[PDB]
Amino acid sequence: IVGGYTCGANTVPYQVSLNSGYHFCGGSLINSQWVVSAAHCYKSGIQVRLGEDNINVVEGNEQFISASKSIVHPSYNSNTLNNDIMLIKLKSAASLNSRVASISLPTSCASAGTQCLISGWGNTKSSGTSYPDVLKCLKAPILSDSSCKSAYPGQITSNMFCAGYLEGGKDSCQGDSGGPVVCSGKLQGIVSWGSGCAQKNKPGVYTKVCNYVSWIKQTIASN
Protein backbone atom coordinates (compact mmCIF):
# COMPACT_ATOMS: atom_id res chain seq x y z
CA ILE A 1 0.00 0.00 0.00
CA VAL A 2 1.58 3.35 -0.98
CA GLY A 3 0.52 6.51 0.91
CA GLY A 4 -1.26 4.48 3.61
CA TYR A 5 -0.98 4.17 7.41
CA THR A 6 -0.26 1.40 9.92
CA CYS A 7 -3.59 -0.27 10.63
CA GLY A 8 -2.82 -1.33 14.20
CA ALA A 9 -2.55 -4.98 15.26
CA ASN A 10 -5.66 -7.07 14.59
CA THR A 11 -7.90 -4.13 13.58
CA VAL A 12 -8.61 -5.86 10.21
CA PRO A 13 -9.53 -9.30 11.57
CA TYR A 14 -10.62 -10.78 8.21
CA GLN A 15 -7.29 -10.05 6.44
CA VAL A 16 -5.22 -13.14 5.62
CA SER A 17 -1.70 -13.54 4.16
CA LEU A 18 -1.20 -16.34 1.57
CA ASN A 19 2.24 -17.81 2.22
CA SER A 20 4.54 -20.22 0.28
CA GLY A 21 7.70 -19.64 2.35
CA TYR A 22 7.11 -15.83 1.97
CA HIS A 23 4.01 -13.58 1.69
CA PHE A 24 2.83 -13.42 -1.94
CA CYS A 25 -0.85 -12.29 -1.82
CA GLY A 26 -3.61 -11.23 0.57
CA GLY A 27 -7.12 -12.63 0.94
CA SER A 28 -10.30 -12.24 3.03
CA LEU A 29 -11.85 -14.73 5.42
CA ILE A 30 -15.60 -15.05 4.63
CA ASN A 31 -16.51 -17.97 6.94
CA SER A 32 -14.49 -20.32 9.21
CA GLN A 33 -13.35 -22.60 6.40
CA TRP A 34 -13.21 -20.32 3.29
CA VAL A 35 -11.12 -17.42 1.99
CA VAL A 36 -11.62 -15.30 -1.16
CA SER A 37 -8.59 -14.03 -3.06
CA ALA A 38 -7.66 -13.26 -6.69
CA ALA A 39 -7.35 -15.99 -9.31
CA HIS A 40 -4.05 -14.59 -10.44
CA CYS A 41 -2.62 -15.45 -6.99
CA TYR A 42 -3.15 -19.16 -7.62
CA LYS A 43 -0.29 -21.63 -6.99
CA SER A 44 -0.11 -24.93 -5.12
CA GLY A 45 1.37 -25.28 -1.62
CA ILE A 46 -0.50 -22.38 -0.05
CA GLN A 47 -0.52 -21.92 3.72
CA VAL A 48 -3.13 -19.36 4.89
CA ARG A 49 -1.97 -17.19 7.79
CA LEU A 50 -4.73 -15.61 9.91
CA GLY A 51 -4.45 -13.14 12.84
CA GLU A 52 -1.29 -11.58 11.53
CA ASP A 53 0.10 -8.11 12.00
CA ASN A 54 3.95 -8.45 11.72
CA ILE A 55 4.34 -11.31 9.14
CA ASN A 56 8.01 -11.94 10.10
CA VAL A 57 7.45 -12.44 13.88
CA VAL A 58 5.07 -14.87 15.71
CA GLU A 59 3.41 -12.33 18.17
CA GLY A 60 0.47 -14.48 19.23
CA ASN A 61 -3.04 -14.72 17.65
CA GLU A 62 -1.68 -16.30 14.48
CA GLN A 63 -3.37 -19.45 13.07
CA PHE A 64 -1.47 -21.13 10.14
CA ILE A 65 -3.76 -23.47 8.18
CA SER A 66 -3.04 -25.26 4.93
CA ALA A 67 -5.38 -24.84 2.01
CA SER A 68 -7.27 -28.09 1.18
CA LYS A 69 -8.27 -26.83 -2.39
CA SER A 70 -8.24 -23.58 -4.37
CA ILE A 71 -11.06 -22.94 -6.90
CA VAL A 72 -10.23 -20.40 -9.60
CA HIS A 73 -13.35 -18.99 -11.37
CA PRO A 74 -13.92 -21.26 -14.47
CA SER A 75 -14.07 -18.16 -16.76
CA TYR A 76 -10.98 -16.46 -15.38
CA ASN A 77 -8.95 -15.00 -18.29
CA SER A 78 -5.27 -14.46 -17.45
CA ASN A 79 -4.87 -11.97 -20.26
CA THR A 80 -7.66 -9.55 -19.39
CA LEU A 81 -7.94 -10.51 -15.70
CA ASN A 82 -11.68 -10.69 -16.15
CA ASN A 83 -13.23 -12.84 -13.37
CA ASP A 84 -10.10 -12.49 -11.21
CA ILE A 85 -11.50 -14.28 -8.13
CA MET A 86 -10.63 -17.56 -6.36
CA LEU A 87 -12.01 -19.42 -3.33
CA ILE A 88 -9.63 -21.36 -0.99
CA LYS A 89 -11.03 -23.99 1.35
CA LEU A 90 -9.02 -24.50 4.58
CA LYS A 91 -7.96 -27.98 5.79
CA SER A 92 -9.56 -27.23 9.24
CA ALA A 93 -11.82 -24.43 10.35
CA ALA A 94 -10.27 -21.33 11.88
CA SER A 95 -11.10 -20.30 15.50
CA LEU A 96 -13.09 -17.03 15.15
CA ASN A 97 -13.24 -14.36 17.86
CA SER A 98 -12.31 -10.60 17.80
CA ARG A 99 -8.80 -10.86 16.35
CA VAL A 100 -9.87 -13.36 13.66
CA ALA A 101 -13.37 -12.81 12.18
CA SER A 102 -15.04 -13.18 8.79
CA ILE A 103 -16.23 -10.24 6.60
CA SER A 104 -19.77 -10.27 5.08
CA LEU A 105 -20.47 -10.57 1.37
CA PRO A 106 -22.55 -7.67 -0.10
CA THR A 107 -26.22 -7.70 -0.94
CA SER A 108 -25.96 -4.84 -3.45
CA CYS A 109 -23.07 -3.25 -5.32
CA ALA A 110 -21.51 0.00 -4.06
CA SER A 111 -21.80 3.34 -5.75
CA ALA A 112 -19.16 5.76 -6.92
CA GLY A 113 -18.04 7.94 -4.04
CA THR A 114 -18.37 5.19 -1.37
CA GLN A 115 -15.24 5.27 0.88
CA CYS A 116 -13.59 1.86 1.36
CA LEU A 117 -10.70 0.38 3.31
CA ILE A 118 -7.98 -1.46 1.39
CA SER A 119 -5.29 -3.29 3.38
CA GLY A 120 -2.21 -5.45 2.78
CA TRP A 121 1.51 -6.11 3.17
CA GLY A 122 2.46 -5.04 -0.37
CA ASN A 123 5.06 -2.59 -1.49
CA THR A 124 4.91 0.90 0.04
CA LYS A 125 6.99 2.61 -2.76
CA SER A 126 5.73 3.26 -6.32
CA SER A 127 9.24 3.60 -7.72
CA GLY A 128 11.26 0.63 -6.29
CA THR A 129 10.41 -1.97 -3.59
CA SER A 130 10.10 -1.60 0.24
CA TYR A 131 7.93 -4.32 1.85
CA PRO A 132 6.56 -3.61 5.39
CA ASP A 133 6.46 -6.01 8.32
CA VAL A 134 3.07 -4.91 9.58
CA LEU A 135 -0.29 -4.45 7.90
CA LYS A 136 -0.94 -1.13 6.13
CA CYS A 137 -4.30 0.49 5.47
CA LEU A 138 -5.65 2.98 2.96
CA LYS A 139 -9.05 4.68 2.73
CA ALA A 140 -9.99 5.11 -0.95
CA PRO A 141 -13.21 6.01 -2.78
CA ILE A 142 -14.82 4.00 -5.64
CA LEU A 143 -14.56 6.10 -8.81
CA SER A 144 -17.25 6.52 -11.46
CA ASP A 145 -17.36 4.15 -14.35
CA SER A 146 -16.66 7.00 -16.77
CA SER A 147 -13.47 8.02 -14.97
CA CYS A 148 -12.39 4.38 -14.73
CA LYS A 149 -12.98 3.72 -18.48
CA SER A 150 -11.34 7.03 -19.45
CA ALA A 151 -8.23 5.86 -17.52
CA TYR A 152 -8.09 2.33 -18.96
CA PRO A 153 -9.93 2.53 -22.31
CA GLY A 154 -11.07 -0.91 -23.58
CA GLN A 155 -9.79 -2.77 -20.46
CA ILE A 156 -12.60 -2.47 -17.91
CA THR A 157 -15.31 -5.16 -17.94
CA SER A 158 -18.48 -5.09 -15.90
CA ASN A 159 -16.71 -7.26 -13.31
CA MET A 160 -14.26 -4.54 -12.37
CA PHE A 161 -14.30 -1.07 -10.76
CA CYS A 162 -11.64 1.52 -10.05
CA ALA A 163 -10.92 2.97 -6.60
CA GLY A 164 -8.27 5.41 -5.58
CA TYR A 165 -6.88 8.82 -6.37
CA LEU A 166 -6.23 10.31 -9.82
CA GLU A 167 -3.67 12.72 -8.34
CA GLY A 168 -1.31 9.77 -7.54
CA GLY A 169 0.49 9.07 -4.23
CA LYS A 170 -1.98 6.61 -2.63
CA ASP A 171 -2.77 3.10 -4.05
CA SER A 172 -2.53 -0.67 -3.45
CA CYS A 173 0.68 -2.13 -5.03
CA GLN A 174 2.39 -5.48 -5.66
CA GLY A 175 1.91 -7.81 -2.68
CA ASP A 176 -1.57 -6.41 -1.99
CA SER A 177 -3.14 -8.57 -4.78
CA GLY A 178 -6.01 -10.72 -3.56
CA GLY A 179 -6.72 -8.57 -0.56
CA PRO A 180 -9.94 -6.85 0.53
CA VAL A 181 -11.64 -3.64 -0.42
CA VAL A 182 -14.30 -3.24 2.35
CA CYS A 183 -17.01 -0.60 2.22
CA SER A 184 -19.62 -0.12 4.92
CA GLY A 185 -18.66 -3.50 6.41
CA LYS A 186 -19.13 -5.57 3.24
CA LEU A 187 -16.43 -7.06 0.99
CA GLN A 188 -16.92 -5.15 -2.31
CA GLY A 189 -13.58 -5.67 -4.05
CA ILE A 190 -10.43 -7.76 -4.42
CA VAL A 191 -7.10 -6.09 -5.32
CA SER A 192 -6.53 -7.08 -8.96
CA TRP A 193 -4.42 -4.86 -11.28
CA GLY A 194 -3.36 -1.35 -12.24
CA SER A 195 -0.55 0.42 -14.20
CA GLY A 196 2.35 0.90 -11.81
CA CYS A 197 1.46 2.02 -8.27
CA ALA A 198 0.03 5.40 -7.30
CA GLN A 199 0.73 7.02 -10.66
CA LYS A 200 -1.29 10.04 -11.70
CA ASN A 201 -4.44 9.22 -13.66
CA LYS A 202 -3.96 5.44 -13.17
CA PRO A 203 -6.21 4.29 -10.28
CA GLY A 204 -6.31 0.69 -9.08
CA VAL A 205 -8.74 -1.84 -10.54
CA TYR A 206 -10.63 -4.29 -8.37
CA THR A 207 -12.74 -7.37 -8.95
CA LYS A 208 -16.44 -6.44 -8.39
CA VAL A 209 -17.48 -8.98 -5.77
CA CYS A 210 -21.22 -8.16 -5.84
CA ASN A 211 -21.31 -9.85 -9.29
CA TYR A 212 -20.11 -13.17 -7.77
CA VAL A 213 -22.18 -13.62 -4.63
CA SER A 214 -24.41 -16.38 -6.08
CA TRP A 215 -21.36 -18.11 -7.62
CA ILE A 216 -19.52 -18.04 -4.24
CA LYS A 217 -22.55 -19.31 -2.34
CA GLN A 218 -23.24 -22.09 -4.84
CA THR A 219 -19.60 -23.17 -5.03
CA ILE A 220 -19.20 -23.29 -1.19
CA ALA A 221 -22.45 -25.21 -0.87
CA SER A 222 -21.27 -27.93 -3.24
CA ASN A 223 -17.68 -28.29 -1.84
Ligand X SMILES: *C(=O)CCCC1CCNCC1
Q: Taking CB under 6 A as the rule, does residue 172 contact ligand X? A: yes
**93 DSSP assignment:** P
Select the residue interacting with ligand X from 193, 208, 209, 216 (CB under 6 A): 193
175 is in an annotated binding site: yes
Q: What are the start-end ranges of the H helices in 121-172?
A: 145-151
Q: Is 84 a catalytic residue?
A: yes
* Residues between 49 and 88 that touch ligand X (CB under 6 A): none
- By C-beta, is 132 or 204 nearer to ligand X? 204
From the list 69-77, 86-94, 103-111, 191-199, the region that binds ligand X by CB under 6 A is: 191-199
Among the options 28, 73, 84, 102, which is catalytic? 84
CA distances from 69 to 4, 73, 104, 111, 157 (A): 33, 13, 22, 33, 28
Among the options 17, 28, 37, 40, which is catalytic? 40
Q: Taking CB under 6 A as the rule, does residue 122 contact ligand X? A: yes
Report the nearest approach of ligand X to the CB of residue 167 (Å).
Answer: 15
Report the nearest approach of ligand X to the CB of residue 70 (Å).
Answer: 16
33 is in an annotated binding site: no
Q: Could you give the 3-state DSSP secondary structure of residue 152?
A: coil
Q: Taking CB under 6 A as the rule, does residue 168 contact ligand X? A: no
Burial 28-61 (b: 16+ CB within 10 A, else e): bbbbebbbbbbbbbbeeebebbbbbbebeeeeeb
* Residues between 162 and 221 that touch Ca ion (CB under 5 A): none
Cα–Cα distance, 101 to 55 (Å, whole number): 18
CA distances from 124 to 8, 11, 128, 171 (A): 16, 19, 9, 9
Q: Which residues are catalytic?
A: 40, 84, 177
